Paper text:
Opioid-binding protein cell-adhesion molecule like (OPCML) is a glycosylphosphatidylinositol (GPI)-anchored protein that localizes to the outer leaflet of the plasma membrane and acts as a tumor suppressor (TS). OPCML consists of three Ig-like domains termed D1, D2, and D3, connected by short extended linkers. OPCML is composed of three canonical Ig-like domains with a C-terminal GPI anchor localized in the plasma membrane outer leaflet. We previously reported that OPCML interacts with a subset of RTKs and induces their degradation and/or dephosphorylation when re-expressed in ovarian cancer cells.
To localize the clinical mutations on the three-dimensional structure of OPCML and to gain insights into their role in the tumor suppressor mechanism(s) we crystallized soluble recombinant OPCML (residues 36–316) and determined its structure using a combined single-wavelength X-ray anomalous dispersion/molecular replacement approach. Structure solution was complicated initially by a high degree of translational pseudosymmetry, but identification of the correct space group and non-crystallographic symmetry elements allowed for chain tracing, which was followed by rounds of automated and manual model building and refinement. The OPCML homodimer resembles an inverted V shape, with dimerization mediated by a membrane-distal D1-D1 interface stabilized by a combination of hydrophobic contacts, hydrogen bonds and salt bridges. This interface comprises 874 Å2 of buried surface area and has a solvation free energy gain (ΔiG) on formation calculated by PISA to be −9.5 kcal M−1. The OPCML dimer is stabilized by reciprocal salt bridges between Arg 65 of one monomer and Asp 80 of the other. Below this lies a network of mainly hydrophobic contacts mediated by the stacking of Trp 82, Ile 74, Leu 69, Thr 114 and Arg 127. Overall, the D1-D1 dimerization interface is highly conserved since five of the seven key residues at the interface are absolutely conserved across the IgLON family (i.e. Leu 69, Ile 74, Asp 80, Trp 82, and Thr 114), with conservative substitutions at the other positions (Arg 65 is Lys in LSAMP and NEGR1 and Arg 127 is Gln in LSAMP, IGLON5, and NEGR1). Well-ordered glycans were observed at each Asn 70 in the crystal structure, allowing modelling of NAG-NAG-MAN glycosylation sequences. Asn 70 and the first NAG residue are completely buried by D1 and lie close to, but do not make specific contacts with, the reciprocal D1.
Residue numbers in the entry:
A (entry chain B): 42 to 174, 179 to 319
B (entry chain A): 42 to 173, 179 to 319
The structure:
């Protein structure tokens, strides 16, 4: 056969089967004579002789280097004609991601280009995979146009050349999008009890909240109520409810590229049918 | 240079200059070892060693063949790294015409194709030349509507600028219907041998016939002898009479046409202009 394939750092064995009565025999690395009979031309201690019988002439390149890849010939001399047999030593290298795109934040609707360049022997192929809801691309470049919020998360570059494990590495796209209210219940409370309104927005970056009644803002320091903010969530607390506290309150979530609000009612208890 | 160019059948000399402290040396024919130090690997008596000094390792392939053309490498081993140096043996062969078109006869107006195929190293170029004029410079010379003046010998010359160019010729003969090319009148005193004669120009040669008043004259008849060379024909009178003076017609004929002329056997007398 034509190909002798060896993984880098292991030993390559170059065996020459000899069917004809041979007078002289040699192993060549390109046009340099490595071994001629028992006479070692090379000074490389990696190149050693293994078999020297009239049926076989075999050497070994231990700890193979990329620089070893190339044509090695078993050249001989018979009593009739010279004969040769050429083999190609192919060195294989596990794949490795060199440069990878670094994490990004981008606003919704814009474009994103991720780039994954890798090396290996033979030249590796590469696949991108979105790690949420997914083979998105199979090229060094992954290009996304009009990025939606659900396209955020981790994209995984996987480079393989069918030598050892493929090399994987990941990059995180975080998409900014304006807020929307995702929780807003009404609450009923009897006069004189503790009443809790609360909203929850979904936004990147997180939304800040503000509480209004009839389009006038409520501050925390005011008596009888307190505004508390968590991640995404915000609560307006009444400690002693009165008949005036009843009504509609608007929770306004804002972030650097938009705002939204919802309105919820602090109402009094009572029976209801349908 | 990298190229050693040798004429086929001469000797090629492969000299390897060695500007280094070399421990081992060899001449390779492609991936075949020819000579390693003083150890001749080749069994070809043409390959002989010429120089084996610390500064030079040189062999010779005497009586070089085309099959020798290729890369020959002077491979060595130094104290530090192996080194090589390729030279390219280029074999040159004088040009030679292999097959050539054979002589033809063809009728006027038809087509003729002459073909001249030749070989050589490097591959030769070819020119045709009409010997009666470089008509073409290709293996194929194509002539359409061949005229009578295009007959004769066409010469193929193949050259590659090594040794002499090879030449060989082919003969086109064009058939055409006759035309009269000589027809003088002749005057003769009564009682003396008088010779009329015509000459036609035709391929193949024209045969002649002699007429008087659109009636043929035969050779066996007494007093007249008709004699035909190639182009020429002669009507001979041995005893002239007043009945014989007058106009005679020369009819030249060949396989693809005829023509005639008239000439007068005339009697003496005064004439003005
Ligand atoms: C088979 O033949 C090839 C071609 O000559 C040999 O490749 C050569 O290998 C050496 C190292 O093995 C390379 O030289 C130097 O390596 C050192 C690293 O220590 C570096 O510092 C130098 O910059 C340089 O690279 C050399 O470049 C390379 N030459 C070529 C044309 O590839 C190979 O060694 C031979 N292998 C066997 C088993 O005989
Ligand atoms: C250098 O190496 C080449 C091949 O690597 C040698 O070429 C071989 O040369 C011989 C004759 O010199 C050829 O054998 C002849 O074959 C013809 C028919 O093709 C036959 O008529 C003859 O009787 C003869 O056996 C051989 O085919 C040819 N092989 C190739 C692949 O070209 C060359 O001789 C070497 N030159 C040297 C050692 O000076
Ligand atoms: C809430 O949203 C509406 C638009 O739908 C707007 O008219 C209103 O002013 C907003 N309320 C507050 C307090 O921003
Ligand atoms: C008052 O709250 C209720 C419940 O969401 C809503 O239907 C109504 O439109 C709100 N009106 C205003 C001005 O917020
Ligand atoms: C000679 O030529 C003319 C026409 O070219 C023709 O009339 C005549 O018959 C021809 N033959 C002879 C024998 O004159
Ligand atoms: C006969 O001879 C005369 C004298 O040249 C010439 O003018 C005339 O054309 C000829 N007629 C024929 C039929 O040959």
């Amino acid at each position: 056969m034509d190909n002798v394939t060896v993984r880098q750092g292991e030993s390559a064995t170059l065996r020459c089967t000899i069917d004809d009565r041979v007078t002289r025999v040699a192993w060549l690395n390109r046009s340099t004579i490595l071994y001629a009979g028992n006479d070692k031309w090379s000074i490389d201690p990696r190149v050693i002789i293994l078999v020297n019988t009239p049926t076989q002439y075999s050497i070994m390149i231990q700890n193979v280097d990329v620089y070893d890849e190339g044509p090695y010939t078993c050249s001989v001399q018979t009593d009739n004609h010279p004969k040769t047999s050429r083999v190609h030593l192919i060195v294989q290298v596990p794949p490795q991601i060199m440069n990878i795109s670094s994490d990004i934040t981008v606003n919704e609707g814009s474009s994103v280009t991720l780039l994954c360049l890798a090396i290996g022997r033979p030249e590796p192929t590469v696949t991108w995979r979105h790690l949420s809801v997914g083979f998105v691309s199979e090229d060094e470049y992954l290009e996304i146009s009009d990025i939606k919020r659900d396209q955020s998360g981790e994209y995984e570059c996987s480079a393989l050349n069918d030598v050892a494990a493929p090399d994987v590495r990941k990059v995180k796209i975080t998409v900014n999008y304006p807020p929307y209210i995702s929780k807003a219940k009404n609450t009923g409370v009897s006069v004189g009890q503790k009443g809790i309104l609360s909203c929850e927005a979904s936004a990147v970056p997180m939304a800040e909240f503000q509480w209004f009644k009839e389009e006038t803002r409520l501050a925390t320091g005011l008596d009888g109520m307190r505004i508390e903010n968590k991640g995404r969530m915000s609560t307006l607390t009444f400690f002693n409810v009165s008949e005036k506290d009843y009504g509609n309150y608007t929770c306004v979530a804002t972030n650097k590229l938009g705002n939204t609000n919802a309105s919820i009612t602090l109402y009094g208890p009572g029976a209801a049918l349908v």
